[PDB]
Amino acid sequence: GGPLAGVKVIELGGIGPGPHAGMVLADLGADVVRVRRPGGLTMPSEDRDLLHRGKRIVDLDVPQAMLELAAKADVLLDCFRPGTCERLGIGPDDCASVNPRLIFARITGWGQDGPLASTAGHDINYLSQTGALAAFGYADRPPMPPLNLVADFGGGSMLVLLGIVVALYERERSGVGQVVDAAMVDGVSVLAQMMWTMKGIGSLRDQRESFLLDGGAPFYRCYETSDGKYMAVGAIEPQFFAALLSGLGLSAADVPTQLDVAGYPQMYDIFAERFASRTRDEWTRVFAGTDACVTPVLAWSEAANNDHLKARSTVITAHGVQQAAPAPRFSRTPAGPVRPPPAAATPIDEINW
Amino acid sequence: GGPLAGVKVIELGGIGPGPHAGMVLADLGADVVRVRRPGGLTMPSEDRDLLHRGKRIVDLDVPQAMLELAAKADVLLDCFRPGTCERLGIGPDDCASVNPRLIFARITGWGQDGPLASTAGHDINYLSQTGALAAFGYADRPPMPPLNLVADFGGGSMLVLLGIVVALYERERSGVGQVVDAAMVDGVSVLAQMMWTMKGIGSLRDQRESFLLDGGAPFYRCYETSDGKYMAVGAIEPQFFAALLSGLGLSAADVPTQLDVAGYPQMYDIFAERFASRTRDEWTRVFAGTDACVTPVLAWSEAANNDHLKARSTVITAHGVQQAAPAPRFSRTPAGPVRPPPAAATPIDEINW
Q1: Where is this region: Disordered (chains A, B) (predicted)?
Q2: Which of B74, B78, B123, B152 is catalytic?
Q3: Is the dihedral of CA A277, A280, A284, A285 positive or negative?
Q4: Catalytic annotation on B122?
Q5: Which residues does A288 contact at the CB level (< 8 Å), separation at least 6?
Q6: What is the DSSP letter of A53?
Q7: Which residues of B touch A195 (CB under 8 A)?
Q8: CA distance B56 to B10
Q9: What pairing do the DSSP bridges indicate for beta strands B220-224 and B230-234?
């Protein structure tokens, strides 16, 4: 039942990255157990939060009697502000005494140390300091955050997840766990390495919509269709640019060359023109199966019924509602079928550890 | 020297997710070795690509004499289209024979199985199928991709990274490795779980700029300042919304209530008004240190010199140019200082395995 089967995990804070990491841990077979006060004002109801599926809720106001729990656990996922966790009985030091095999993970937007460390903030904020946000969106309108996928999960949840499974492989040889500091601002900055590479090389400019991946290239952006929908183009490689020009019913000689940056504004118009003369459906048909790198922008509802995502069963309907199947996928020790979120809190003495 | 010290890794494909994962592996102590044909047309020169720092390049056209290499290695990071890897000598099967301890990781946008599997595509494309892209940007203009941070790295590089370190912990007990299928469309969908949760709960609407994290809430977006800069606001919690309203010099009674969604359009104007009457600098001073969740949107250049990111040394200047320090951070087995990208390809018989 999952490659991470047998791993005892203790989830504390209940928001964004914290719980999302917990989820994956459970999805991969780990025995995850949330610890939170009963008067929880969580939204939605835990029993309806896909971020808690496969987990077990346990009332336990922090009464330091939990140090007794950690000692039996492998991982402790701290999700509170820095310090608060050690302000109470629990903490990297205390836990160390009760269990030196413990993996003290900590997901934060600012990290443990630093001036901003005490400051409160969210995904949009952490992205403001890294410079990633300032490289998003159209030139005129202010920067618009990609929901909270970049910092909270892409560079938050995944970061602490990486750190945990790594701190596991470590102690699984050093026989001793340690503290893992997962800072969102850190993760995002690493997710942006390619940009830094560019920045040093001189491939970046000052204004937005100038780079290759920020809309500055007509062959890598979105075009509205006749029926008010959208198509996503990413014809980067010259070979794929060919396909794009082909299915679009355009002769290479008609449209400027990829190299003719100066004529991009014109290429955009030619692309916008053609793309808006048909419906997403028709277009999807045309570029279908070709290496043109042209796909239809699907909505949540639309995606869950997508042929590909269905075949590979990425978005499945597990007892209840539509959701995302565990990932990545393992060949010999795959993830068992998805269990539902905790229908009701489990006692505490009915643990297992 | 890193928690992943001693891990033999073989990097094949050389684009986006593949090499970015390889980097982190090296950053964490792993012995990563890239294998690619000599006539490589890579951009930029490998010796100037931060995604290759701490790694070793090795000329080796695929001449199946590499199966002999895998057998000594722990991980094989396949980054080619599905099939191509097994179309040559190498492949999950063949490698299994020479080394059953091998971890055959595979990062793909569409994954191994599925109709689209053979189709070519990029970050913007993979995001179009999951439905995450259709939830990005302003309502009028088409969706604009957050560079390639979401799919390529946030749900690509990190996914295969997770899969690997997990497959390591697995075999590090089952004494047998396996195949890891990291599909970007898969990772992104898991990065979007929160959304799916919302989708089933009924918190999502059909149009954009309607949810809490997509700009539909004036207290969670960006505002242009007097000096044409931008400030990122994320005052979600009522307590923080207070601070926002305070430093902004507004009386609770002046601006509509968070609950008065119908008056959001108005709240937006009041926020845009005040925010645009001062410079990012001044504003940064005002909301500085307060839990208002109001920060300045910094550009790449500006971020590298940011006080916080400097203290925690997130963006450091390693021998040469500016880049992102390793992550996450470990307390007993931290990451050694960052080495530079391969100055020159290393032979092949000078390996170590």
Answers
A1: 322-353
A2: B152
A3: negative
A4: yes
A5: none
A6: T
A7: 147, 300
A8: 10
A9: antiparallel
Chain A residues within 8 A of B165 when measuring between CB atoms: 162, 165-166, 168-169
> In this structure, are residues B73 and B101 in contact, taking their beta carbons and an 8 Å threshold?
no
Are the Cβ atoms of B312 and A161 closer than 8 angstroms?
no
Angle at B277 between CA B275 and CA B279, to 5 degrees: 80
For chain B, give every domain's residue range: 1-209+299-353, 210-298
Beta-carbon-side half-sphere exposure of residue B178 (alpha carbons within 13 Å): 24
User: Number of helices (H) and strands (E), helices first, in chain A?
Assistant: 13, 12
What's the CATH superfamily of B210-298?
A: formyl-coa transferase, domain 3 (3.30.1540.10)
Cα separation of B218 and B270, whole Å? 10
CATH topology of domain B1-209+299-353: Rossmann fold (3.40.50)
Dist. CA B109–CA B317, nearest whole Å: 32
How was this model experimentally determined? X-ray
The amino acid at residue A156 is G
The values of phi and psi at residue A280, to 5°, are -45, -40
Distance CA A31, CA A55 (A): 7
In order, the DSSP letters of B214-239 are SS-STTEEEEE-TTS-EEEEE--SHH
The Cα–Cα gap between A30 and A24 comes to: 9
For residues B164, B167, B169, B171, the Cα torsion angle rounded to the nearest 10 degrees is -140
Chain B nearest-CA distance from A164, in A, is 9
Residues in contact with A337: Cβ distance below 8 Å, sequence separation at least 6, in sequence order: A318
Structure-token match 């910094």, residue found: B298
| Alpha carbon distance A4, A9 (integer Å) | 11
The reply to whether A1-209+299-353 and A210-298 are identical in fold is: no
Tokens for A111, please give them.
Answer: 């990290």
Residues B99, B76: Cα–Cα separation, whole Å: 11
Q: What is the Rg, in whole angstroms, of the alpha carbon atoms belonging to chain A?
A: 24
Residue A106: helix, strand or coil by DSSP? strand
| B20 catalytically annotated | no
Resolution to one decimal, Å: 2.7
Strand B31-36, strand B103-108: pairing: unpaired
- Which residues are bridge partners to A178 per DSSP? none
Grouping H, G, I as helix, E, B as strand and the rest as coil, residue B182 is: strand
